[PDB]
Amino acid sequence: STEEFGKILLKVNQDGSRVLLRDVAKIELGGENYDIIAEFNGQPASGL
Amino acid sequence: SDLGKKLLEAARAGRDDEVRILMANGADVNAADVVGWTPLHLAAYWGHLEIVEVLLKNGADVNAYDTLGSTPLHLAAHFGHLEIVEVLLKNGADVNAKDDNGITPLHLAANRGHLEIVEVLLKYGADVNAQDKFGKTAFDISINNGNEDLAEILQ
Amino acid sequence: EDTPQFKIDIDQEKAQALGVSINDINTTLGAAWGGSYVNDFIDRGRVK
């Protein structure tokens, strides 16, 4: 899950405050690439 | 025992009719596999509510601990079995039970974010300030997991 | 059928706090308990 990736501990500061991956990045499920986008009669579509 | 191993299998599989017949013939309810899991441990784990009640009616140890100190309430709370958690607590389950790690049913419930079970545990007097071997509370888990709903409940 | 298995959770915060790398932790565990194929040697003109 995106949650689990968010919890990833990058480092801990001197005071002891945790720096998680979600503190330095936005974490979501998204395509390996965003180059190819398809439509079927002006309607959102994929295909093979 | 013979029936002890059959009850362990029956309780796990969730065959209510077989468990009934075993309780009549007198299958050992305190039977334990190599890891120290009783039929109640298994019933609680696999979410078999009817068998949990049947086992407890037949003098099953509610505060039985495995070889690492985990109880049926730890399992029921961790895997989100609200109905079984209530039954266990009604029959006198140690709400502040600590395993060998110092983890409680509240810690485990908070970790998977079972909001209903967390409020049930707190109702039956769960120690909200209870710390595991790393000094982490159910609240420390909630803010790390990023569970805003769970965070509000523990205040 | 499913069998009882010993789940071990490595605390990332505690590891970084004591200054112990996860590689050294996961190597020490994996090598000792699981075994580790390091490299090859020649026994009487036979690579093993």
CA distance B131 to C13: 16
Are the CB atoms for B18 and B24 separated by under 8 Å? Answer: no
Are the CB atoms for B41 and B75 separated by under 8 Å? Answer: yes
How many structural domains is chain B composed of?
Answer: 1
Contacts of residue C39, Cβ cutoff 8 Å, sequence gap at least 6: none
Q: Does C13 touch chain B (CB under 8 A)?
A: yes
Q: Biggest alpha carbon distance in chain A?
A: 58
From chain B, pick out residues whose CB is under 8 angstroms from the CB of A20. Answer: 144
Residues 131-150 of B with CB under 8 A from A: 144-146
**Would you say the C-alpha torsion B139, B141, B147, B150 has a positive or negative sign?**
negative
Residue A27 buriedness (CB in 10 A; 0-12 / 13-18 / 19+): middle
Q: Could you tell me which residues are beta bridge partners of residue A45? A: A38
Q: Resolution to 1 decimal, in Å?
A: 2.8
Closest approach of chain C CAs to the CA of A30, in angstroms? Answer: 27
From chain C, pick out residues whose CB is under 8 angstroms from the CB of B134. Answer: 11, 13-14
From chain A, pick out residues whose CB is under 8 angstroms from the CB of B110. Answer: none
Q: Which domain holds residue B87?
A: 1-155
DSSP secondary structure code for residue C48 in this structure: -
Q: Could you tell me which residues are beta bridge partners of residue B132? A: none
- DSSP collapsed to 3 states, chain A: CHHHHHHCEEEECCCCCEEEHHHCCCCCCCCCCCCCCEECCCCEECCC
Q: What is the helix (H) or strand (E) element at residue C28, kind and residue range?
A: helix C22-29
User: What chain B residue is nearest to C3 in terms of C-alpha separation?
Assistant: B35
Are the CB atoms for C15 and A18 separated by under 8 Å? Answer: no
Experimental technique of record? X-ray
Closest CA to B133 of B103, B94, B93: B103
Are the CB atoms for B41 and B64 separated by under 8 Å? Answer: yes
- DSSP collapsed to 3 states, chain B: CHHHHHHHHHHHHCCHHHHHHHHHHCCCCCCCCCCCCCHHHHHHHHCCHHHHHHHHHCCCCCCCCCCCCCCHHHHHHHCCCHHHHHHHHHCCCCCCCCCCCCCCHHHHHHHHCCHHHHHHHHHCCCCCCCCCCCCCCHHHHHHHHCCHHHHHHCC
